Amino acid sequence: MLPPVGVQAVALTHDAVRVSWADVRLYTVRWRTSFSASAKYKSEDTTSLSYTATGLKPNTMYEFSVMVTKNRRSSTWSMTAHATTYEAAPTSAPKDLTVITREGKPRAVIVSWQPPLEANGKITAYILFYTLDKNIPIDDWIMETISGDRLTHQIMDLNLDTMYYFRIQARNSKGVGPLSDPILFRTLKLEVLFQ
Amino acid sequence: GMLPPVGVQAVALTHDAVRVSWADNSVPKSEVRLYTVRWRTSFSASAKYKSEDTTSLSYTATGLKPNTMYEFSVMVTKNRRSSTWSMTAHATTYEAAPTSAPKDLTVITREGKPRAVIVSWQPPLEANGKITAYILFYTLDKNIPIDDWIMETISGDRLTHQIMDLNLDTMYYFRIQARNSKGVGPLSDPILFRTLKLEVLF
Amino acid sequence: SQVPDQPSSLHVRPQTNCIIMSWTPPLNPNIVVRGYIIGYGVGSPYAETVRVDSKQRYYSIERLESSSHYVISLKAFNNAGEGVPLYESATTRGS
Amino acid sequence: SQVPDQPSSLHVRPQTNCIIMSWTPPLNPNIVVRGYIIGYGVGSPYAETVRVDSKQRYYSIERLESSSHYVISLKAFNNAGEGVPLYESATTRG
């Protein structure tokens, strides 16, 4: 039989994409992550001229193909349609948060991290929280906003021999992901620092 | 004649928010310095700014136009003495779902082959981003809801679409809406097009 | 002696490549009818034109394309001229 | 006969360009003290070094840069060597 034509795939939500083609005959629609190792498909059957592929990973590009079947006779697969699903707030937190004293200038540290695994989109900005107090809530810490293109930041004029707390989170076009777990960094005292 | 702040950085957050952040090489350690932050649409007629005052080293510019480029400048003021504005930092806000509907939806019979029309429209005024696709609904029935019309998906770069195999002497209804990387705008107003009968056409 | 009227009724029964027409003379018997003029085409009844006897009620159109929208006209005529036509839309049955 | 102890107390009173030190001799009087060796710099006490009399308790550091984080060391010394230092952080007023 003749495969369907005018196949187009349009992203709805961040996990839904609606394929739509033009021509009882049954249509089968297959899809697959275009950038992955698994060369295996997922598919579903319908009798409408459209179908919504759901349960997808956000900010990901998918390829869609439709065939038609009627009375034991199946057609070949149609031209593939490409669709990228919408973005979503990050799910993980930034990883490997590290604080190291800057040499040879004490009272200042260089904070280094790595982007989150589940960014679910392009990271617009990083938010870095740090404080001296053990009790005050997160919204009263010192806040520093670093661009998404930077993975390091310089903090200056800290206190000597004092325990600092560090929290970092990733932002995104549709919101901000969860904070990481606290990182404890103790600035050294001059006695230990010089030998 | 004070020193203007340096290392001024402007980072777009949402589609309506941008966070400016600067540094001052003059902050000691009794007196507190006030920072003034200005912003403005870089491509506009109005050479006028909006501004706000803070004592922090950062500020969030809100209530901005989406998919638009803004320019930001910071100065510092202390005891009657103002500095010059720092170098400008540019930031472009992210996209958002369209708010208006596509305009001037047009349906005209294709000559000289009846039963087929060419539907023409124009992009929405408030697109708030790059239009990925148009969704065109049309039906023969007066009563069925929008989700049971005939749906046609046109690419965002095209402003025309061809519908074929219509019925002769029948009233058709047309609806169109624009989608976008961040969502879908509202449907347009109904367009009434009456296909002609063979008697009148010849 | 005068221009004839339009035909009373016109029926079409499309085939896979043929189309069969069935009609009846004008409801007004006073006016003389010398014959009928049939026209057909795609989206236009001017493409093809045949003229048949006044006593014929059926005509079979041949060699038409499958799955197509044809337009058929029918007019009665006499020595005065041609009468107002009847129009009918017919769709060929696909294979 | 041996290296002296660390000073008992050290106080600093930073100015806009000066920094004033006030200290007191080691708690152990038996060990001889020939004098005190002061060190200062930014983020390091190795940058500048002066040595003063055993009878001094006050010293005024001059010609320092305004609004900076200085590190000050203080050690007592005698014919044996140098004793364990005392450290103090002081910040200049801008």
Author numbering:
A (entry chain D): 838 to 860, 872 to 1043
B (entry chain B): 837 to 865, 870 to 1042
C (entry chain C): 723 to 817
D (entry chain A): 723 to 816
Manuscript text:
Deleted in colorectal cancer (DCC) is a single pass transmembrane glycoprotein that was originally identified in humans as a candidate tumor suppressor.
Here we have undertaken a structural and functional analysis of the DCC construct DCCFN456, with a 22-residue long “artificial” linker composed of Ser-Gly-Gly (SGG) repeats (herein referred to as SGG-22) between the FN4 and FN5 domains. Since there is a 22-residue linker between the FN4 and FN5 domains, which is disordered in the crystal structure and can potentially stretch somewhere around 80 Å, we cannot authenticate which FN4 domain is linked to which FN5 domain to form one molecule. In the concave-shaped CFG β sheet, a group of hydrophobic residues M921, W931, Y895 and the aliphatic portion of side chains from R884 and R865 emanated from different strands stack on top of one another, forming a “hydrophobic ladder”. The critical residues involved in the netrin-1 binding to site 1 and site 2 cluster on either side of this hydrophobic ladder, respectively. A stable, solid FN5 domain has therefore evolved to serve a key role in netrin-1 binding, able to resist the force generated by the binding from the either side.
